[PDB]
């Protein structure tokens, strides 16, 4: 690495940092011998110098060269840790997978101090020891002669281009808060540190100020420079640098197959389901609840197209969250997606009057590569939402889940079988089967949903046996967009094995609605408990985070 | 893939595109047998249908199901080529390396029509057949029954988010220009095509409108939708899609080891060098001349911190191009860089008064991953430029090149040897060797250049034997920044094996300057011809593009 000058012209001196291999410049000034003092190891391949331990005084060790020349050596220990192996308290670049390395940050997007409405990352202060549990700890470890820093100084810095993405605090009292001051942040990218001589350890707390986005890959690098200050009228020179690389934890969404934790909310049926599912039911608009995870802590985060002690909030934003959903974990042509894929609806090709999810949302979700996006066709609906025809439920067998699609074909087959058995007068079935306009409107919808069937089984790695066809009819409005004919039986509330399904008011045979019996015959064989809720159509459900750690995936 | 409905309720019909495997929905309506007509192949694993050739009439082939049900089939050929194998005229996603696939675009940044000062990609017209040689050709190949398009239509489109990055023209008369109209561009992302029945081939010309940047990864996708138009009062449905993916060719720089082509320009010495090097010498500020390459054409491009028929211009922008240079091809810890690495100077850590190359230039150069960037320390200079201490020249042996550094140590050793032989009065050498202030200024510079020696040999995969130490002294100015003591002998003009070196006016022994003899003894053994130019310090040199194709690299 670093080159050391050796010459007969006069004695020289250099500083070596433990773990760094340096080179000696002997052949530039005068076949020679190297005589190294105890604790100094020199190899020839081209002369490489290394030292076993830090010195207690300036010029503690020396190397003599005989062809004569003399070099003095001072050894120091300078290193920065920052949780590189991903386990916490561990005491090169960032890589992916179970065999990789690199530090992780959380965005400090919760509100631990209840005396203010502001977000914890918006100010320049740590007001409580609880906020430190949301920050990544790194230790600066040093060992030098007691007088070493009279001719040397250490500077900690972050690249100017990312100084508004990270803030670094001084850990006065270590694990405890004591109104910590700022070392780095949006007001300056670098600062000197008054490091004393001897063996010392200083703690820093590092927090992320933003989520990954189009202009932010997610990596933040903190570097420490050792400068030579020995001549007070001469500019300072760099003699050693060391650094650690962090990645900002991405926002991860939970699908319907993750066990539920709590429900925010008709209420008699929701309470009954919350009790059978062993969930916490409490008292806002529709929002998507996800999380961010680091080796030291997991934090819930709300995504808004509201903050609590460990309840995070992120924005980064005309189609609402009924158009944004997530699959269960899948394998696609040999590639694994341990956290599933993110599904959103749009148009099959752009036009002068079509709709799509705003590009800022597509860029935000795509910028966080742990859950790959999928484009589905939804612009054929009056509202344009995926949840109108597509939903997921758990299953105990091979796949672990089922994909549920709306099927006009399943409803027409059910009505024709009732007509064949002499029930055409039930409310009527004969008036629905004879309506040519309704059949033609559903024929358009059948091709639309079947196009999505192909996109879903191609992108999610599914078989036809993994898909259930739930009877559901559609009609076109005065603007030619699809709307439900009767209450939507696919857009259900899922709490583990208990399903809160909107109640249909279709034809009834022997005391039971034909649509409810058909739905039960498709879902109850999987162990799923079906209840039909009167007038089903501000409800949000938080699910358990994945057991899989997102940094072990290889996108 | 696409699902086809089969039922005893009534006969059905579907369209199959050659090369696509479709599925038959038989078990949803009624153990059965499949009777397929000639040219129709059906496999069971789960029933997969495929067809051998396109039909000449609607309902040409049929499949009978006996448990009875009947399905009619029409076969069509619909495909889009676009040079997927990278050879030209070939007739999934984009991948890197010699075993990959995907189409390539050039940015139409030259000026082929000399009647206007505008750039060819700025307007919506192709004014000359020569401009078509700078555009990527793709053929749309179709074969349908003569009456097929009375119930079907084809739409070509580009994703809305990238519609301002690509323009697609109609190839009236094929290889020739005939004032071609626009199919796609910044004014609309999609358009229908009037495709007739029978066997036809339509040509398109696709051009890129921008270079890769922070908000542009370089990929552009063009998709063709087949729509079912059979019911004029019912919305159109998608039944088939196909697409091709293009990458925009990045800007590539040429190092000093590429053979020269022409020189833009004291002139008596430049003409002498241009003649010995067999180069074209002709009659602007300093600019960096590179190129963009695609399988069908190579185009020179000028990068500005001016346009000709095949002479491109790109901007995307306080440190000028003396601070931006390129290494020869290298191997770094087992990773190959066939096109070298891009070197630029900045500060060792940011401060409240330091300098760096503007972030827009770092983002533009980093956005084009074919030549990886390297950060060097140059803020210690009065001007902050890399070219002040670092340059490259060819070499015939092991490495193929040499890395040249300024060395105050080489100049002081040369002067001390002359002093030891009794030449201290030459102009004086004794007055330079006795000047303690000059020695202390150079000691600071020695550590600065040695820091860069470590960065260069670590990032470029070099040995100490690959580096030559050229005698050069420095002094600090009234603002503490480094300036040359005597004319800079590292910042030379390289034309193959002939070097245009600024002339020093240092001590002379036996009719020759000591600095010139030392430089000759270091460079002439490599076959390099050295000439020393009086008053050396608007010159630009264009080099031959690399023989290696950038799309065969794996960044």
């Amino acid at each position, epitope marked *: 690495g670093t080159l050391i000058r050796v010459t007969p012209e006069q004695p020289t001196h250099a500083v070596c940092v433990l773990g760094t291999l340096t080179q000696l410049d002997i052949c530039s000034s005068a076949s020679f011998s190297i005589n190294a003092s105890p604790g100094v190891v020199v190899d020839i391949a081209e002369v490489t110098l290394t030292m076993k331990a830090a010195s207690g005084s300036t010029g503690d060790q020396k190397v003599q060269i005989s062809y004569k020349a003399l070099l003095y050596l001072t050894g120091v220990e300078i290193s920065l840790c920052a949780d590189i192996t991903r386990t916490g308290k561990v005491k090169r670049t960032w890589t992916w997978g179970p065999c990789g390395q690199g530090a992780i940050l959380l965005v400090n997007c919760d509100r631990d101090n209840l005396e203010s409405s502001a977000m914890d990352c918006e100010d320049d202060e740590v007001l409580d020891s609880e906020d430190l549990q949301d920050m990544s700890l790194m230790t600066l470890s040093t060992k030098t002669p007691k007088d070493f820093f*009279t001719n040397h100084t250490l500077v900690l810095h972050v690249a100017r281009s990312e100084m508004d993405k990270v803030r670094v605090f001084q850990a006065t009292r270590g694990k405890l808060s004591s*109104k910590c001051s700022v070392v780095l942040g949006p*007001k300056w990218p670098s600062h000197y540190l*008054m490091v004393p001589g001897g063996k010392h350890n200083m703690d820093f707390y590092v927090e992320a100020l933003a989520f990954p986005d189009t202009d932010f890959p997610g990596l933040i690098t903190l570097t420490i420079s050792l400068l030579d*200050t020995s001549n*007070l009228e001469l500019p*300072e020179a760099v003699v050693f640098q060391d650094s650690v690389v962090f990645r900002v934890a991405p926002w991860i969404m939970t699908p319907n197959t993750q066990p539920p934790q709590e429900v925010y909310a008709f209420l008699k049926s929701v309470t009954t389901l919350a009790m059978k599912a062993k969930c916490k039911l409490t008292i806002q608009d529709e929002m998507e609840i996800g999380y961010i995870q680091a080796p030291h802590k997991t934090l819930p985060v709300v995504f808004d197209s509201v903050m609590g002690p460990d309840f995070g909030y992120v924005t980064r934003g005309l189609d609402s969250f009924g158009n944004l959903e997530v699959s269960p974990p899948v394998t696609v042509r040999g590639k694994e997606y341990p956290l599933g894929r993110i599904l959103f609806g749009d148009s099959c090709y752009p036009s002068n009057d079509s709709r799509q999810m705003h590009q800022a949302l597509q860029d935000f979700l795509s910028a966080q590569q742990v859950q790959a996006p999928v484009k589905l066709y939804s612009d054929w609906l009056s509202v344009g939402h995926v949840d109108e025809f597509l939903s997921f439920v758990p299953a105990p067998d091979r796949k672990g889940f089922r994909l549920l699609l709306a099927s006009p074909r399943s409803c027409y087959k059910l009505f024709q079988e009732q007509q064949n058995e002499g029930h055409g007068e039930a409310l009527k079935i004969k008036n629905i089967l004879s309506n040519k306009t309704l059949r033609e409107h559903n024929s358009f919808v059948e091709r639309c949903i079947d196009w999505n069937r192909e996109l879903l089984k191609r992108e999610l790695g599914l078989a036809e046996s993994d898909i259930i066809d739930i009877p559901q009819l559609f009609k076109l409005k005065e603007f030619s967009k699809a709307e439900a004919f009767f209450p939507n039986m696919v857009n259900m509330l899922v709490l583990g094995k208990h399903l809160g399904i909107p109640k249909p008011f279709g034809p009834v045979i022997n005391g039971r609605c034909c649509l409810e019996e058909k739905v039960c015959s498709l879902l109850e064989p999987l162990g799923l408990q079906c209840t039909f809720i009167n007038d089903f159509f501000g409800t949000n459900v938080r699910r358990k985070p994945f057991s899989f750690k997102w940094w072990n995936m290889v996108p | 893939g696409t699902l086809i409905r089969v039922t005893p309720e009534q006969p059905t019909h579907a369209v199959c595109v050659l090369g696509t495997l479709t599925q038959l929905d038989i078990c949803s309506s009624a153990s059965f047998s499949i009777n397929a007509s000639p040219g129709v192949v059906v496999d069971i694993a789960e029933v997969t249908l495929t067809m051998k050739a396109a039909s000449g009439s609607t309902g040409d082939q049929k499949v009978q199901i006996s448990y009875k049900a009947l399905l009619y089939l029409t076969g069509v050929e619909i495909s889009l080529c676009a040079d997927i194998t990278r050879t030209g005229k070939v007739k999934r996603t984009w991948t890197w390396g010699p075993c990959g696939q995907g189409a390539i675009l050039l940015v139409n940044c030259d000026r082929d029509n000399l009647e206007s000062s505008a750039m060819d990609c700025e307007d919506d017209e192709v004014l000359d057949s020569e401009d078509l040689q700078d555009m990527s050709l793709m053929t749309l190949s179709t074969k349908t029954p003569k009456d097929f398009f009375t119930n079907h239509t084809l739409v070509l489109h580009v994703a809305r988010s990238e519609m301002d990055k690509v323009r697609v023209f109609q190839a009236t008369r094929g290889k020739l220009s005939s004032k071609c109209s626009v199919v796609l561009g910044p004014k609309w992302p999609s358009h229908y095509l009037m495709v007739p029945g029978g066997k036809h081939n339509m040509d398109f010309y696709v051009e890129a409108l921008a270079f890769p940047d922070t908000d542009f990864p370089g990929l552009i996708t063009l998709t063709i939708s087949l729509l079912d138009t059979s019911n004029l009062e019912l919305p159109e449905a998608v039944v088939f899609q196909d697409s091709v993916v293009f990458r925009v060719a990045p800007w590539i720089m040429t190092p000093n080891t590429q053979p020269p082509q022409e020189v833009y320009a004291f002139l008596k010495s430049v003409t002498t060098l241009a003649m010995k090097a067999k180069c074209k010498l002709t009659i602007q500020d300093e600019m960096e001349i590179g190129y963009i390459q695609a399988p069908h054409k190579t185009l020179p491009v000028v990068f500005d911190s001016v346009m000709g028929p095949d002479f491109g211009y790109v901007t995307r922008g306080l440190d000028s191009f003396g601070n931006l240079e390129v290494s020869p091809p290298v191997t770094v810890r087992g990773k190959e860089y066939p096109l070298g690495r891009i070197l630029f100077g900045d500060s060792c850590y940011p*401060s409240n*008064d330091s300098r760096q190359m503007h972030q827009a230039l770092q983002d533009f150069l980093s956005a084009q991953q074919v030549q990886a960037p390297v950060k060097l320390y140059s803020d210690w200079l009065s001007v902050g430029h890399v070219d002040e201490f670092l340059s490259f020249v060819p070499a015939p042996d092991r490495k193929g090149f040499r890395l040249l550094l300024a060395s105050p140590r080489s100049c002081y050793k040369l002067f001390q040897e002359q002093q030891n032989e009794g030449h201290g009065e030459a102009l004086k050498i004794k007055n330079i060797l006795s000047n303690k202030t000059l020695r202390e200024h150079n000691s600071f510079v020695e550590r600065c250049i040695d820091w860069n020696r470590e960065l260069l040999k670590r990032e470029l995969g070099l040995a100490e034997s690959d580096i030559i130490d050229i005698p050069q002294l420095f002094k600090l100015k009234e603002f503490s920044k480094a300036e040359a003591f005597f004319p800079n002998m590292v910042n030379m003009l390289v034309l193959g094996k002939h070097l245009g070196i600024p002339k020093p006016f240092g001590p002379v022994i036996n009719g020759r300057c000591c600095l010139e003899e030392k430089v000759c003894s270091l460079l002439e053994p490599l076959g390099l011809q050295c000439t020393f130019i009086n008053d050396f310090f608007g010159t630009n040199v264009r080099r031959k593009p690399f023989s290696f194709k950038w799309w065969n690299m794996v960044p």
Partner: antibody, heavy 121, light 109 residues
Framework: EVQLVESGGGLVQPGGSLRLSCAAS????????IHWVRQAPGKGLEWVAS????????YYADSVKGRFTISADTSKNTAYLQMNSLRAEDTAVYYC??????????????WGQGTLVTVSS | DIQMTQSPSSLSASVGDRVTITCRAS??????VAWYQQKPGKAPKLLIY???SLYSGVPSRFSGSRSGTDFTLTISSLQPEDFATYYC??????????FGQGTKVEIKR
């Protein structure tokens, strides 16, 4: 030789503002950290604020956070301290001192003579 | 925000005696301390710039020490010019300093 000369003192009203300055001679302020220290009549030393013009950082004591602002001009070799919303408790002599952090120690070597700021109706 | 207490608040001795002034920090500061002397009407003068080590130009009568979080200044062979108010300064990483209450040394009679 090194010298620090404070100015900008005097008498002000409660709720008002006042700016102090300190001109440096013998060194360039861009290479040193500059501190202000307050001493009320009959009391000890209180640290007020610091600036490091080379890095651009500033720090303040809890007793003045949100009221006091510290700055420096490297072309005039002069440091400044801007006071706002002064109260009777802010009456004291304000000293300007140099911190040569490049020498490895935390102590303040050169101090000025001090300027009295009085807050009273 | 590490707090400190300086004591005794008043000391007395005759010329030629040996006196000590101490201060306790609530938490360790890794030897980041300094000592100052002040006379009425004058700015504070630096004696010690780090634990123990003496500032250039100060008489050899002054020396410092540390034991855990307790820091001490020893003044040997006390001279008439040494009768002044002394302050303990606590420092750390970054330029943020905290001063003690201060102690006065007077003349015994």
């Amino acid at each position: 030789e090194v010298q620090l000369v404070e100015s900008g003192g005097g008498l002000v009203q409660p709720g008002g503002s006042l700016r102090l300055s300190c001109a440096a001679s013998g060194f360039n302020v861009s290479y040193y950290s500059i501190h202000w220290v307050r001493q009320a009549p009959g009391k000890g030393l209180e640290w007020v604020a610091s600036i490091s013009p080379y890095y651009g950082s500033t720090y303040y004591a809890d007793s003045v956070k949100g009221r006091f602002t510290i700055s420096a001009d490297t072309s005039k070799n002069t440091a400044y301290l801007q006071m706002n919303s002064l109260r009777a408790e802010d009456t004291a002599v304000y000293y300007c001192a140099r911190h040569p952090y490049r020498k490895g120690y935390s102590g303040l070597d050169y101090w000025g003579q001090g300027t009295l700021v009085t807050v009273s109706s | 925000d590490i707090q400190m207490t300086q004591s005794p608040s008043s000391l007395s001795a005759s010329v030629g005696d040996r006196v000590t002034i101490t201060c306790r920090a609530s938490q360790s500061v890794s030897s980041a301390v300094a000592w100052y002397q002040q006379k009425p009407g004058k700015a504070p003068k630096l004696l010690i710039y780090s634990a123990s080590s003496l500032y250039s130009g100060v008489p050899s009568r002054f020396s410092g020490s540390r034991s855990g979080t307790d820091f001490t200044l020893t003044i040997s062979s006390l001279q008439p010019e040494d009768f002044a108010t002394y302050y303990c300064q606590q420092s750390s990483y970054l330029p943020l300093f905290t001063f003690g209450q201060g102690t006065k040394v007077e003349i015994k009679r």
